[PDB]
Design a protein around this ligand. Structure first.
Ligand code: CLR
Length: 65
């Protein structure tokens, strides 16, 4: 769940830094950027649907109506 370990001139030892928040560790060397249709979960690998909210009957801004 943490990509972009960039290899130096020698292809043996790498430095690992976090990718972007909206990006993924889908592959070892690819940040996937899962689309806006669904939000990253706790682990940065694998997409997860966004929770949905609606007009709640107990909404504080729906008392006077
Ligand atoms: C007492 C209730 C059930 C009926 C009468 C409600 C009337 C008086 C209206 C007039 C203005 C209204 C408030 C206007 C704005 C807010 C801020 C919001 O973040 C929570 C609800 C709250 C606090 C409303 C509550 C209901 C309210 C006080």
């Amino acid at each position: 769940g943490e990509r972009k370990k960039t290899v130096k001139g020698m292809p043996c030892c790498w430095h690992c830094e976090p990718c972007t928040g909206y990006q993924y560790q889908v592959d070892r060397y690819t940040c996937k950027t899962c689309p806006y249709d669904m939000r990253p979960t706790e682990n940065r690998t694998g997409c997860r649907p966004i929770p949905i909210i609606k007009l709640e009957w107990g909404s504080p801004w729906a008392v006077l109506p």
